[PDB]
Amino acid sequence: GELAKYGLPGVAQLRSRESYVLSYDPRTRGALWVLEQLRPERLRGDGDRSACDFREDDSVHAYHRATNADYRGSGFDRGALAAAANHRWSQRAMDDTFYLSNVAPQVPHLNQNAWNNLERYSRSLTRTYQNVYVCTGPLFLPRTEADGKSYVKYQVIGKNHVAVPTHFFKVLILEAAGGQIELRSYVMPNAPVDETIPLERFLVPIESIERASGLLFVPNILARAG
Amino acid sequence: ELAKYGLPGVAQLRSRESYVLSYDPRTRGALWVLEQLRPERLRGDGDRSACDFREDDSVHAYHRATNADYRGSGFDRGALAAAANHRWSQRAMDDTFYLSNVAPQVPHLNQNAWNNLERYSRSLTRTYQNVYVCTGPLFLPRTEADGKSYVKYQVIGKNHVAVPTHFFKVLILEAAGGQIELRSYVMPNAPVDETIPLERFLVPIESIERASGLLFVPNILARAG
Ligand SMILES: [Cl-]
Ligand SMILES: [Cl-]
Ligand SMILES: [Cl-]
Ligand SMILES: [Cl-]
Ligand SMILES: [Cl-]
Ligand SMILES: [Cl-]
Ligand SMILES: [Cl-]
Ligand SMILES: [Cl-]
Ligand SMILES: [Cl-]
Ligand SMILES: [Cl-]
Ligand SMILES: [Cl-]
Ligand SMILES: [Mg+2]
Ligand SMILES: [Mg+2]
Numbered sequence: 141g142e143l144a145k146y147g148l149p150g151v152a153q154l155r156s157r158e159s160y161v162l163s164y165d166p167r168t169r170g171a172l173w174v175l176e177q178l179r180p181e182r183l184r185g186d187g188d189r190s191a192c193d194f195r196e197d198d199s200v201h202a203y204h205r206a207t208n209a210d211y212r213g214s215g216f217d218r219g220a221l222a223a224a225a226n227h228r229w230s231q232r233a234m235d236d237t238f239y240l241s242n243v244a245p246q247v248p249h250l251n252q253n254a255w256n257n258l259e260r261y262s263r264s265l266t267r268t269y270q271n272v273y274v275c276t277g278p279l280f281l282p283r284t285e286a287d288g289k290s291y292v293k294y295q296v297i298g299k300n301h302v303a304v305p306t307h308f309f310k311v312l313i314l315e316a317a318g319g320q321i322e323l324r325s326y327v328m329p330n331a332p333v334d335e336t337i338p339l340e341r342f343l344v345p346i347e348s349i350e351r352a353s354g355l356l357f358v359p360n361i362l363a364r365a366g
Numbered sequence: 367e368l369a370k371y372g373l374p375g376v377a378q379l380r381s382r383e384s385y386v387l388s389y390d391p392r393t394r395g396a397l398w399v400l401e402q403l404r405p406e407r408l409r410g411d412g413d414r415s416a417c418d419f420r421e422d423d424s425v426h427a428y429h430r431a432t433n434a435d436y437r438g439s440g441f442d443r444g445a446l447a448a449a450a451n452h453r454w455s456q457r458a459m460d461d462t463f464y465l466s467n468v469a470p471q472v473p474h475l476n477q478n479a480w481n482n483l484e485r486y487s488r489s490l491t492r493t494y495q496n497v498y499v500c501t502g503p504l505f506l507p508r509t510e511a512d513g514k515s516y517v518k519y520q521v522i523g524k525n526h527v528a529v530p531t532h533f534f535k536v537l538i539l540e541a542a543g544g545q546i547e548l549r550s551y552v553m554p555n556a557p558v559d560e561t562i563p564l565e566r567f568l569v570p571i572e573s574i575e576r577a578s579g580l581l582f583v584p585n586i587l588a589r590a591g
Contacts, residue, residue, distance in 0.1 A: 142402065143385075143402045146585050146586055148386070148400065149585070150398065150581065163376065166580070168579075172375050173374055175368065175373065176368075177367065201581060271367075296517055354391030355391070357371075364372065
C-alpha cells in the first residue's frame with residue numbers, strides 16, 4: 141500500500157568495482173564482505189600504486205563515509221580486504237582496491253605479516269586451480285567477561301567512528317580443473333599474529349563464520365552445484 | 367563470472383501485515399521497522415497475550431533470535447512496531463510478535479517511558495492525517511579512560527542476540543496542507559524516569575542518521591518535489 145510513501149530508510153548497498161564487488165555497512169563505515177575472482181590469466185600485470193594512496197568513497201554518503209582523517213593518528217593501517225596485488229592486471233582494477241570502502245582498521249603487524257602471507261597464499265592457489273574466489277570481511281566477535289555475561293566490544297576511530305574489527309575472515313572457493321570445487325575458510329584476530337604459525341591453523345568450519353558474520357555461503361554453493 | 371556462487375549477504379527486507387522491516391543477521395535484530403499509523407487502524411478487536419512471542423522462521427536458524435535467547439536474560443522482548451498499533455486486524459497484531467520485530471529491552475523502559483512514547487505517537491493520529499513511525503536500535507560509542515572510543519553491548523543467549531544501547535523512533539507527521547513535520551526521539555536502553563517529558567528526548571534527525579547508518583531527510587526531500 142502507501143507504507144513506503146517516504147521511501148525506506150536503508151537498503152543493501154552493493155558496489156561493483158573493476159576488481160571486486162562489495163556490500164557496504166554504513167553503521168560500521170566498512171564493508172560487510174568483499175568478493176573477488178582470481179585466476180592466473182587475469183592476475184599479473186603492470187599496475188602499481190603507492191602503498192598509502194587510499195581515497196575515501198564519494199559514492200558513500202558523507203555521514204557514513206570513512207576518511208583518511210579517521211585513520212590518521214589511530215595506530216591502525218588502512219587494511220585492504222580485496223588486495224591491491226590481486227589486481228595488477230589493470231591500473232583501474234588496482235586503483236579500486238584503494239577506496240576506503242574496501243579497507244578496515246587493521247593492526248599494522250597483521251596487515252604486514254600474517255594477513256599478507258594469507259593473501260599471498262590465496263594468490264598462489266591460482267597456479268593450481270582454474271579459479272580462486274575470495275570473500276573477505278570483518279568479524280565482531282563476542283567475548284565472555286568476569287560477570288558471566290557476553291559482550292561485543294570494539295574500538296571506533298576518527299570523527300566518523302569507523303569500527304575496528306575484532307577479527308577478519310577469508311573464504312576461498314577453489315575451482316579445480318573441471319567441476320570439483322573446494323571450500324577453505326580462515327579467521328585471524330585483529331592482532332599481531334605470529335607469522336611462523338602455519339596458515340592451516342587458522343582454518344575454521346565455514347558454519348562458524350556464517351553464524352558469527354550473519355552471512356551465508358554454503359546454501360549458495362549447494363544451489364550452484366545444481 | 368564473479369557472482370557464479372551467488373552473493374553471501376544482501377538486504378533482508380520483510381513485509382508483514384502491520385509493518386515493513388529490514389533485518390540485520392549479525393546482531394539478530396531489525397535495523398529498522400516502518401509503520402503507517404492511521405486513526406481507523408488503532409481501533410479493533412485484535413488482542414494477544416503479552417508474552418506470546420514467536421521466532422521468525424523466515425530467518426535462517428543461524429541468525430534467528432529465539433525465545434530461549436531471552437529467557438533468564440533479564441530483558442523483555444521489546445517490540446519495535448507496537449502490538450497496540452495494530453488491533454485493526456488480528457493478523458496485523460500477530461505479526462508484531464515475531465522476534466525479528468523485537469530487541470532485548472530493559473523491562474522498566476519497555477513498560478514505562480518507551481510505552482509512553484508509543485502511546486504518545488499513537489495519539490498524534492487524532493491531529494495528523496498520517497503518522498509514519500520508524501523504530502530501531504542504536505549501538506552508540508562511549509569514551510573510556512584512554513580517551514579512545516568503543517562500542518560495547520551485551521549479547522544474550524546461545525544465538526548472541528545483540529542488546530541495543532539506545533532506541534530511536536522517527537515520526538513523520540503528515541497534515542493535510544502544510545504537510546510534513548519530522549520528529550525524532552532517542553532513549554537509552556535503561557530504566558528511564560517516566561516523569562521526564564517526552565520532548566526532552568527529541569534529537570536532531572542528523573544525529574540518528576549518523577549513528578544508525580540510515581537516511582531519512584533525502585527521501586523526505588525527494589517526495590516533497
Ligand atoms: Cl581521499
Ligand atoms: Cl595505512
Ligand atoms: Cl597488496
Ligand atoms: Cl570493558
Ligand atoms: Cl576493536
Ligand atoms: Cl564479472
Ligand atoms: Cl517460537
Ligand atoms: Cl520452539
Ligand atoms: Cl517479554
Ligand atoms: Cl502494545
Ligand atoms: Cl543520538
Ligand atoms: Mg593489507
Ligand atoms: Mg513494548
